Structure formats: C-alpha cells, structure tokens
Design a protein around this ligand. Structure first.
Ligand code: PEE
Ligand code: PEE
Ligand code: X7W
Ligand code: Y01
Ligand code: NAG
Ligand code: NAG
Ligand code: NAG
Ligand code: NAG
Ligand code: NAG
Length: 1114
C-alpha cells in the first residue's frame, strides 16, 4: 500500500497525466456548458480524488513534518477538490474558483522558480506599503469629503415662471416645480446633466436658469461623488491610479472653481509620482534579489553586393509602405512592377549565394536560411492570402542596422524570463476571466434593461472572449467603467474583483516586466571692462530678473488683451525696450568673451537666435508689417540658463542630457516596429471604416442600408471615421492612440465591425481582430514604451554617484560601509533631568509608553469620528460631531500642557514635540475662527476647516516601515522639487505657445467654454491634465479640425476659428514625448534610487535608528 503509493507518486508519468488532465479541463472550461461537460467534470473530479488519495497514503495527512498538507500546492489541490465535491452534493459562487487549479500549469515552463519566488517576495514585502497606502488614502478622502461634499449635485434649474402657468407663487409650489426633472437644463442627446457653480471661473448657466444644489443624483449612476467617506475613498483611489481621472477632474473644477486644482496637484504628486514608484522599487528589489541568488547558485561575397542588397531592401520597404486606399491605376502599376523586380532580384540573390557558397555552408547560417524562407514565400505568393508574409522582408534590415541587431541580440539572450513572465500574465488573465464570467455572466443578460438603451454594452462577461478582453482592459489600467457597469447590473462583489485585478495585473506583473527590462537592458580696456561687468554677480541677477519679468508680462496676453489699451501699450513699449536690451547684452557678451568662444556655445547660439528674431521683428515693424508673434514669443527660451543654475538642478539636467542619445535610439527602434505594425494595419483595415449615417450622427442598421449604393440612394451620408488606417500616417497616429490607451475604444470598435469595402459595418462581425491589437499592445506598450524609465533610472544612478563625489569603480558593499563610517562620525547624546515630587511623578507618568499608546488610540477614535461625517446629515449630528471634536481638542491640549510641565524647557529638543505644539496652536485657533467665519463664504469656511487634518497627521509617529519610507521621501524631496519646477517651466512655455496657436478654435471635442486656451489659467489647467496623456485624443480632435471652419478676415479683423492639423499634431506629439515619456519618468528614477539606498542601509548595513539605539544605553 505505502510502497505502491510512493512508487506511483515518484513516477513522472503521474504528474504528466495530471497536468494533461488539467489542461483539457481548462480547455473545456472555455466552451459553454452542456450535458457532456457534466460527465467530463465528474471524470476529472474522480481523477483528482485518486491523485489526492495516492498522495495522502504515500505521505500522511498533517501529523508529521513532511505530510501531505505541509505544502501550499497540496493545500490548494485539497481545497479545490473539496469545493468540487460540495458543489456536486448541492452556492453557485464557489464553483467559479475551480479554475485556481490551473495555476499549477505555471510549473511547466522551465525557470519558473525565479519568477514565482520574486512574485511571492514582492507580495510579502508590500506589507509595509499597504498601511501607508491606507493612511494616505484615508487622509486624502477626508480632505476631498471636506472640500467637494455635495458639489456634484449642482444642476441648472429653470426659473419659476411669472406668467402664472404653474399658479401663484408658494414655497411648496416652488419646491414642486424645481424638483421636476423636466425643468433641469440638459443639451439634447446628452446622458448627464451639466454641472454649474457661482464661483468665478466655474460653469455658467444659460439665461433663465439658476444653479441649485441637492437635486437629482450624482454622475455615473451615482457612483462618482464625495458625499460619504466610502465614495470619497473610491474617488481618491481612482485619482491616484489615474483611471479615467480627467472626467472627475473636469467635473470638480466645473462645480467648485479652478483654484481647487491645487487639491488635484497634491494627490497626483504624492499618490502617483511617489507611492506607485515605491511599489515599483519593491518589485525591482525582489526580482534583483532572486536573480542574484539564482546566478550565485549556478562578386556576391563582397561588401558592395551587401550594400546593394541593403539599398534594395530599403527601397522595397518604402514601396511597401507607400500602399494606401483608393490607389490610381498608375500607382498600382508602379508598385506591382517594383514588387516583381524585387522578387526577381531576391531569387537571383538566392541562386548566386547557393552557387558561390557551398549549399551546406549556405544553410549553416541562420540569415541565409531566413532569406531562403523569404524567397519561398515570395515565390508562393506570386504564384497564387500570403501577402502578409512580405513583412518578414522588413526584418532583414536588422542585419545591416547595428542598433536593431543589438536590440534583437539582447532580446534573444534572455528569452526565458520574458516567456515565463508573459505566461504568468496570460494565466492570471485566464483565471480572472473565468472567475468573472462565472460571477457576472447572468447579471448582464437578466438586468439588461437597466442599461441606458436596454442594449448589451460592448464590454461584458457574457462569454469567455469578452471576459478575457475585459480583464485585459483592466490590466491595461482601465477598470472603473467596467466596475460601474457591474454595479449597475450586479452588486458590491464587483468592487473587490476589478480592484484586485488592478493590483496583481498592473502594479505587480507589469512592474515585474519593467524590472526584467531594467535588469536586461542596462580696445584692451574695453574688453577688460566688459569682462568685469560680465562676470559680476549683480549684472547676472539683473538680467535674470528682467527675463523673469518679461516672461510674466508674456503670460498676460490673453483673449481679453485687445480690450485693455494700457496693457497693450505696456507690452509694445516693453518689446521696444527689450530689443535694445538684447542688442546691448549681445554686444557686451561679444566684447567680453570673444567671437570664437561666443559662437562655440549652444546657449550663446540660443541668445543669438533670440537677438536675430527680435531684430527681424523690429525691421518688420519699421517697414509697417505686423510683427511675427512667434518670433517675439521666442524670448521665453532664455529662462533655461537661470533654471539650470538653480541649486540642486545640475543632476537632473545632466541626466537628461546624457539620456538624450539613448532616447533617440529607442525612438528609432519604436518607429521601426510601429512601421511594421502600421503596414499590417493598413493591409487589414484600409478603407473599411466607412459607414452610413443620417442627419444626426447615428449609425444606421445594416438591414435598411446594405452597402454604399443603398446609402446614397436614400440620400444618407457615407462617412469615414476620423481615426483610420487609410495610409501609413493615419496608421501611425491610430497606433499612437492605441498605445497610450486614449481613444482606443472607438478604434477597435470600428475594427471589429469592419467588413468588405463598400459594405455597412455590423456589430462584432470581426471579433477576433482584437488579437491584432493585443499583440501590438504587448510589443508596443509593455516593452518599447518602458525602456525610457529604465534608461532614466540607470543614467540618474550614475549621475547621482558622480554628484556626491563617489568613485564609479567602487562596489556596493564599499559604498555601504563608507556611508556607515560617515554616519558614525557624527553623533552626540543628551539626557533630561527628572523633575518637585508632584512634577517628578508627572514626568514619570508621561514618560511611560502606555501614555503614547493611549494618545494613539484617541487619535484613531477622533479620525473615525471624522469619518462619520456625511452629506445631508441633520443639524443635530453635525453639532454633536463638532462637540466631540472640541472634547478631543481639549484632551490633546491637556496632554500638551502636561508634557510641557513635565519636560519644562526640554520639550523643544525633539522636533516632533514642536510639531505637536504647532498643531495644538493651529487647532485651538482655527476651531474658534471657524465659528466667526460661519456666522458671518462656504468655500472659505471649508478651506480654513482643513486645519483639523494636523491633529490626525500625528498617527504616523511611532511606525518603523512608514518611518523608513518617509526618510527616503525626505531625502528625495529636493530632487523631486527640482523636477517639478522643470516640469512647470515646460508647461509654462507650452501654455504660452498653445494660447498663441489655438485661442480662437470653435468649441468641439474636449474644448468648451470652461476648458480652452483662451487664458493662461485655462491653458495651464489643460496642460496639467495632458501631462499624464489623459484625454489628449479629445484635445487633438478639437485643435486639429479643419472642416466647417470659417477662414480669418484680416480686413474685418476677425481672427478666425479654424484649426490646423499639422500644427496640432506637432504640438501634442512633442508635448507627449517631452512630458509623459521623459520628464514624468524622472520621478520614478529618483524615487527608486533613494528607496533602494535606504533599504540597503537597513538590511546590509547600519541605519540612524541603530545609532540611536546604541546611544540610548550610553
Ligand atoms: C488586493 C485588493 C483588495 C481589495 C479589497 C478591498 C475593497 C473592499 C471594499 C468593500 C466595500 C463595501 C461596500 C459596501 C459599502 O457600503 O461600502 C461603503 C461605500 C458605500 O457606502 P454607502 O454610502 O452606504 O452606500 C450607499 C449609498 N448609495 O463603498 C465604497 O464606495 C467603498 C469602496 C472602497 C474602495 C477601496 C479600494 C482601494 C483599496 C486599497 C487596496
Ligand atoms: C517631437 C515630435 C514632433 C512631431 C512633428 C510632427 C510634424 C507635423 C507633421 C504633420 C503633417 C500633416 O498634417 O500631414 C497629414 C497627413 C495625412 O493627411 P490626411 O488629410 O489625413 O489624408 C486623408 C486621410 N483620410 O499625415 C499625418 O496624419 C501624419 C501623422 C504624423 C505622425 C505622428 C505620430 C508620431 C508617433 C511618434 C512615435 C512614437 C513611438 C516612439 C516611442
Ligand atoms: C460646536 N460649536 C458650537 C463650536 C463650539 C465653540 C466653543 C465655544 C465656547 C466654548 C468652547 C469650549 F468650551 F470648548 F472652550 C467652544 C468652538 C468651536 C465649535 N465649532 C467647531 C468645532 C470643531 F471642532 C470644528 S472642526 O471638526 O473642523 N475642528 C477644527 C476646525 C478648525 N481647525 C482645527 N480644528 C469646527 C467647528 Cl465650526
Ligand atoms: C514651484 C512649483 C513646485 C509649484 C508651482 C506653483 C503652482 C501651484 C501655481 C503656479 C501658477 C498658479 C496658477 C496661476 C493661475 C491660476 C488661475 C486661477 O483662477 C483664476 O484665474 C481665477 C479667476 C477666475 O477664474 O475668474 C486659479 C489658480 C491658478 C490655476 C493658479 C493655481 C496655482 C498655480 C498652478
Ligand atoms: C433621422 C433623424 O432626423 N433623427 C432625429 C430626428 O427624429 C429628430 O427630430 C432630430 C431632432 O434633433 O434629431 C434627429
Ligand atoms: C453593388 C455591387 O456589388 N456593385 C455595384 C457596381 O456594379 C456599380 O457599377 C456601382 C455603381 O456604379 O455600385 C456598386
Ligand atoms: C431632391 C431629391 O434629390 N430628392 C430625393 C428623391 O429624388 C429620391 O427619389 C428620394 C429617395 O427616397 O430621396 C429624395
Ligand atoms: C413635470 O412636469 C411635466 C409637465 O407638466 C409633467 O407632465 C410631469 O408629470 C412633471 N413631473 C412629475 C414628477 O410630476
Ligand atoms: C408636483 O405636484 C403634483 C401635485 O400637484 C405631484 O403629484 C408631483 O409629485 C409634484 N412634483 C414633484 C414632487 O416633483
């Protein structure tokens, strides 16, 4: 018995058979359930029961160290088998989790130990981070509840009629009228009522309407609001994750006012640019430790011919990329004949190489066999669709391109880890897709009526394909809208599901892929006087002040400038003075530094271009020609000299300058892959996005209009989608939209409905086309776009090592010991004299730890009491809560006074004691000021009531891991501030240029009355939103429009209202490249470095806490 059990278990055939059974079960799970599936499930369950019995007989149940249930895998199998039998005997929410058994398949791919261990270590190490996450999220949720409570209920309500239609005015009649939903303003075809607010810069009502509060529900089926602590917490989490956050951002600013942007600036800065980087650093550290441990464990044959082949390949690539929709006969003739010529040339190539070189030698080389494969596909395709395979020819360019060759070599060197990570990703996606299908499949069908039009949405859990796709979307970073739909048709259980899918899929697996990439990819008197003036500090300070003042003056040129004659005159005279100032400065710099040195520098060249532009403007104005606004706007670029000289700024500029070439190379490689994918997409979807529409922009059913002829016969419009794959440029732009995850829903909606050309699209008639996008997203976003962060991390590490004076040849242990010595050098103790008998007793009581524990408990109680608050509460509840807060404040005051008396004047020898004292003063002052403010603006009262957060901020005191994280953040604060300042300068420059370019465009897309480029504040709001790439598709659609736009009339003075496609493309693409992919990532780099350091001080060395402990006994 025991012998038989052990012999059966040890044989690999047993494990192989179990694994094959698991794989067939997984395959059957995808297909819909039928009668045969029941018997198949029974057979699988019997097999699993045999396996469990054999293992338990071989080993034992728990009662010895090496029993059956001493292995987590055995535990998982046992629980799944028991759930199976429980469901066999008889809720239906437990049969969904049998798919967990599929996790075992991860063991097949060789090398899975490292990936699984890294995942486990990351999960274990997130313990210190989760608590800080919860605390920060709660604090931000409380702030948002205090700021935006009830603001999202604002609506435009029609004024009470004075004609007597509703009867004589009464309070009850007025309430009845205003409560009616038909009297609330809403534009036709809109789903959500627009928000309003009487604050300056907020949404304005149409004439005859008033902005009121407390009417109707909140946006997004009531799931978006700050009315209660839970909803505020959810909104703050959404903002931190940047999940469709621009919608909430715009709603908040439209309801409350532009100034509230400050709030969003904080949560984004601390939540996104810092904490998520802590998670990334933890994942990187885990993977680094595991990989380190694993490693420790242990004529024709002439250059001219090759150049000819390379040029032929490049001209074939351009011929291939020249394909587009609706080609004329001649263009197709040229492409066809060139294709024949290229194929003949390649056949000649193959025969010549086979003859000159021995066939064995020819087939020994990998590139030669690759070329032969290309030749055979070319012959097969010309003989007889095999056109797609022509794309293989493009890859032949890698042989003659050293950068691409090195990229491919690096990729193939470490394919195993990438394969393991991708397999883990797909297995997790499959498990969640199965679970979500089982949990929410029936909800969509049963409660379909709850949807706005009673129609099934595009994304749902009806079948396996849709569930897998929706989970993939959640992994990509978009989960809140799917969760909204699930709550609408489901219950609370959707929240934990989708939310979970976000943590594992996005914050761990993708971070693990980033860590993988990072590890693997990584006269004399005049001259003398002028020199003296030039190197004087006062002259430089004066120049910098003048430049800053002129930049601020530039910021005042808004849409309202023509209405202010005085401001116009100030600007004109300032420009006239600046021309002379620039000329004189150039002359002095020349006389000081010499022609060669002046013209050998890039900064002096920038100054020379600015001078030339201003002189050109001066001569144009003298001649009577209107000055070129861009040329005079060029002086903003002079601010970069003083910016680079800001203390602590050298490291950031050095990192960026050193990283420029690597960024350029990565951009070239991405352009190559995107060209390949764009050719594929053009071949797939060229000209298939046309559809038939009516007066109103709604697509007709294929039944009424079968094709183009019917559409034109019935006098309808045959319209093309703005985003399409008509030619290579449109394909590039669409792929850029897809990669950034902005506007991709519509793109793939059109793609999956695409049919033959000149045919009406049908809903989900080409579903499998999603595959084409999946691959791209895998290879375009998860790999190519993540090289920038790795490059920045490495270069910043090197530059920070350089700045501190450290040697590049030293090893990590040497640096750790050097830090330990430097810290050991500085240390001084101190003692406090105990207090007189009563004072000494009070001192002894206060010094006890139980006192601190009690204070912490009181802080927790007060924080909960703050959480109790909600929108629409009664006056009694509000007053009781305020009185409880007063009691808490008095208790804290008593504690502070007791500590002060006990410690006499030593209270101020500990920084946290000064913090407590300041918080006490602030609380006791703001508490009294609140009554006076409330008795005699609600926004001001809400803002000044923020002082309550100080007394709850004390909860961080006493922690160890949170203390370490805050230590790392404090060390990195200065570099973070410098990066933020650089980002602000870039945003200012882009704001002025955008305000110059797109100030008069007609309201469309994301541009409207509230959000536009009309003023500096609105432009800054839009650019802050765009710095994360959020909603840039709508901005592009608004600014790039060139249809139904009236041209400007110079004679009549009308400025025009028409956009510019090329200018908008350049603007937005350059901004996205500069900010999203380079400047933002810097944050991560900085964080990571500092974070890493502290841990290697805590684990492999000594920390300040160690010295404090040592001196405690001293
Ligand atoms: C790994 C990740 C683990 C994820 C699990 C954590 C999420 C569990 C949250 C459970 C929430 C319970 C839902 C029921 C409820 O009422 O909660 C509070 C509240 C609604 O309150 P009421 O106003 O009474 O609603 C009725 C008014 N129409 O629900 C919410 O919006 C809370 C959602 C919390 C988001 C948490 C996500 C972030 C977690 C960090 C990790
Ligand atoms: C720094 C980067 C600055 C970017 C510079 C861009 C300069 C502007 C060029 C735009 C010219 C232009 O308007 O051409 C339009 C012309 C098409 O004309 P249509 O009227 O659409 O024809 C009818 C279609 N049914 O071409 C385009 O649309 C060009 C689109 C340009 C590509 C922009 C995207 C770039 C992607 C960057 C690479 C990302 C990967 C790197 C990592
Ligand atoms: C409850 N009403 C009747 C009054 C009682 C007043 C009062 C009058 C006379 C005597 C006393 C006594 F006995 F206590 F001395 C107290 C003191 C204020 C209190 N109102 C209030 C209390 C708070 F806690 C907060 S708060 O939760 O926002 N806390 C904040 C706010 C801002 N800064 C930091 N903390 C806000 C407010 Cl309006
Ligand atoms: C140095 C770095 C790290 C921080 C930079 C400071 C910012 C927080 C400042 C700089 C410019 C400020 C903006 C200047 C102009 C405005 C317009 C202002 O709204 C108005 O114009 C009110 C009048 C109206 O709307 O009618 C709202 C605040 C805002 C966005 C300011 C908000 C705070 C900003 C972004
Ligand atoms: C085909 C068509 O015209 N559909 C509607 C029409 O019924 C409606 O009257 C109009 C009002 O905006 O909007 C559009
Ligand atoms: C419907 C179809 O398949 N083909 C027709 C084609 O025969 C006709 O010439 C054209 C209009 O001229 O409209 C389309
Ligand atoms: C002025 C005009 O073009 N009117 C057309 C008519 O000729 C055509 O028969 C009809 C088809 O429904 O659509 C309308
Ligand atoms: C709102 O006013 C319309 C117009 O008189 C009326 O038909 C409707 O019943 C009113 N709403 C309610 C809830 O009574
Ligand atoms: C308006 O008054 C009518 C009775 O005259 C009432 O039935 C209706 O509910 C009121 N509208 C509301 C409460 O929105």
């Amino acid at each position: 018995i025991r012998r038989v059990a052990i012999s059966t278990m040890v044989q690999p055939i047993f494990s192989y058979f179990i694994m094959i059974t698991i794989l067939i079960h997984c395959i059957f799970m995808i297909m819909p359930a039928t009668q045969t599936t029941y018997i198949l499930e029974l057979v699988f369950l019997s097999i699993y029961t045999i396996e469990v019995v054999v293992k338990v007989l071989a080993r034992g149940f728990i009662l010895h160290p090496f029993a059956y249930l001493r292995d987590p895998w055995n535990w998982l199998d046992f629980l799944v088998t028991l759930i199976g039998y429980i469901t066999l005997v008889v809720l239906y929410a437990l049969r969904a989790f049998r798919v967990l058994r599929s996790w075992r398949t991860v063991t097949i791919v060789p090398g899975w130990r490292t990936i699984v261990d890294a995942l486990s270590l990351s999960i274990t190490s997130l313990k210190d981070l989760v608590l800080l996450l919860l605390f920060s999220l709660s604090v931000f949720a409380l702030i948002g509840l205090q700021l935006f409570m009830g603001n999202l209920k604002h609506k435009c309500v029609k004024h009470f009629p004075a004609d007597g239609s509703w009867g004589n005015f009464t309070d009850e009649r007025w309430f009845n009228y205003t409560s009616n939903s038909s009297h609330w303003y809403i534009p036709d075809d809109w789903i959500e009522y627009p928000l309003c607010g009487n604050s300056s810069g907020a949404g304005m009502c149409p004439p005859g309407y008033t902005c009121l509060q407390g009417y109707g529900g909140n946006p997004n089926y009531g799931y978006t609001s700050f009315d209660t602590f839970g909803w505020a917490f959810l909104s703050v989490f959404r903002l931190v994750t940047l999940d469709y956050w621009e919608d909430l951002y715009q709603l908040a600013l439209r309801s409350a006012g532009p100034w509230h942007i400050l709030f969003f600036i904080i949560v984004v800065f601390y939540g996104t640019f810092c904490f998520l980087n802590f998670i990334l650093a933890v994942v990187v550290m885990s993977y680094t430790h595991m990989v380190k441990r694993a490693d420790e464990e242990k004529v024709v044959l002439s250059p001219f011919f090759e150049l000819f082949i390379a040029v032929i390949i490049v001209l074939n690539i351009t011929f291939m990329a020249l394909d587009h929709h609706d080609m004329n006969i001649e263009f197709e003739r040229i492409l066809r004949t060139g294709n024949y010529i290229f194929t003949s040339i390649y056949i000649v190539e193959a025969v010549l190489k086979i003859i000159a070189l021995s066939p064995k030698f020819y087939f020994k080389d990998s590139w030669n066999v690759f070329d032969f494969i290309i030749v055979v596909f070319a012959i097969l395709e010309l003989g007889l669709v095999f056109r797609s395979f022509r794309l293989l020819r493009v890859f032949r360019l890698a042989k003659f391109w050293p950068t691409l060759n090195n990229f491919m070599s690096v990729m193939t060197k470490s394919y195993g880890a990438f394969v393991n990570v991708m397999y883990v990703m797909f297995l997790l996606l499959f498990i969640f897709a199965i679970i979500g299908m089982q949990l929410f499949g029936m909800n969509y069908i049963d409660n379909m009526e709850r949807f706005p039009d009673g129609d099934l949405p595009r994304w749902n859990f009806t079948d396996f394909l849709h569930s897998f796709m929706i989970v993939f979307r959640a992994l990509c970073g978009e989960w809140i809208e799917s969760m909204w739909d699930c709550m609408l048709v489901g219950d609370w259980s959707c929240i934990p599901f989708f939310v979970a899918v976000f943590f594992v899929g996005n914050l761990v697996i993708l971070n693990l892929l980033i860590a993988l990439l990072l590890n693997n990819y990584g006269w004399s008197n005049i001259r003398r006087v002028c020199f003296l003036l030039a190197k004087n500090k006062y002259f430089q300070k004066f120049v910098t002040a003048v430049l800053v003042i002129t930049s601020v003056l530039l910021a005042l040129e808004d849409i309202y400038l023509p209405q202010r004659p005085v401001l116009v005159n100030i600007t004109l005279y300032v420009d006239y003075v600046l021309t002379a100032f620039f000329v004189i400065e150039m002359i002095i710099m020349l006389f000081a530094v010499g022609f060669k040195k002046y013209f050998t520098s890039k900064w002096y060249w920038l100054d020379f271009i600015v001078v030339v532009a201003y002189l050109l403007n001066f001569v144009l104005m003298c001649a009577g020609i209107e000055a070129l606004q861009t040329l005079r706007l060029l002086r903003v670029f002079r601010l970069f000299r003083p910016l680079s000289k800001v203390n602590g700024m050298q490291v950031v500029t050095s990192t960026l300058v050193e990283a420029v070439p690597h960024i350029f190379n990565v951009i070239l490689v991405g352009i190559f892959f995107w060209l390949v994918f764009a050719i594929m997409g053009v071949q797939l979807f060229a000209g298939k996005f046309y559809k038939c529409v009516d007066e109103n922009s709604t697509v007709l059913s294929h039944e009424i209009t079968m094709d183009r002829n019917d559409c034109l016969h019935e006098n309808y419009t045959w319209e093309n989608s703005p985003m399409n794959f008509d030619h290579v440029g449109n394909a590039y732009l669409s792929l850029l939209q897809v990669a950034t995850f902005k506007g991709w829903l519509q793109i793939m909606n059109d793609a999956i409905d695409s049919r033959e050309v000149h045919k009406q699209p049908i809903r989900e008639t080409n579903i499998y086309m999603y595959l084409y996008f999946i691959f791209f997203i895998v290879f375009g976003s998860f790999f190519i776009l993540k090289l920038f962060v790795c490059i920045l991390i490495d270069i910043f590490r090197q530059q920070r090592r350089k700045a501190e004076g450290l040697s590049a040849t030293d090893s990590r242990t040497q640096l750790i010991y050097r830090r330990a010595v430097m810290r050991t050098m500085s240390a001084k103790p101190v003692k406090r004299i105990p207090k007189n008998k009563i004072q000494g007793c009070i001192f002894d009581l206060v010094t006890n730890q139980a006192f601190d524990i009690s204070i912490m408990v009181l802080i927790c109680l007060n924080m909960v009491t703050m959480m109790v608050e909600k929108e629409g509460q009664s006056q009694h509840m509000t007053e009781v809560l305020y009185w409880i807060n007063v009691v808490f404040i008095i208790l804290f005051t008593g504690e502070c006074v007791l500590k002060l008396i006990s410690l006499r004047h030593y209270y101020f020898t500990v920084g946290w004691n000064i913090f407590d004292f300041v918080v006490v003063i602030i609380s006791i002052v703001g508490m009294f000021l609140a009554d006076l403010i409330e008795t005699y603006s609600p926004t001001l009262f809400r803002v000044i009531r923020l002082a309550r957060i100080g007394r709850i901020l004390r909860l961080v005191k006493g922690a160890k891991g949170i203390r370490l994280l805050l230590l790392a953040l404090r060390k990195a604060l200065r570099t973070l501030f410098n990066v933020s300042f650089l980002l602000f300068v870039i945003m200012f420059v882009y704001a002025v240029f955008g305000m110059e370019f797109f100030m008069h465009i007609r309201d469309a897309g994301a541009i409207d009355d509230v959000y536009n480029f009309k003023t500096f504040g609105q432009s800054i709001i839009l650019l802050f939103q765009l710095a994360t790439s959020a909603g840039w598709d709508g901005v592009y659609f608004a600014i790039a429009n060139e249809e139904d736009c009236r041209a400007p009339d110079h004679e009549l003075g009308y400025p025009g209202n028409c956009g510019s496609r090329a200018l908008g493309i350049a603007y937005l693409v350059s901004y996205l490249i500069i900010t999203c992919l380079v400047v933002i990532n810097m944050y991560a780099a900085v964080i990571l470095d500092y974070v890493l350091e502290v841990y290697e001080d805590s684990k492999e060395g000594l920390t300040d806490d160690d010295y404090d402990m040592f001196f405690e006994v001293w």
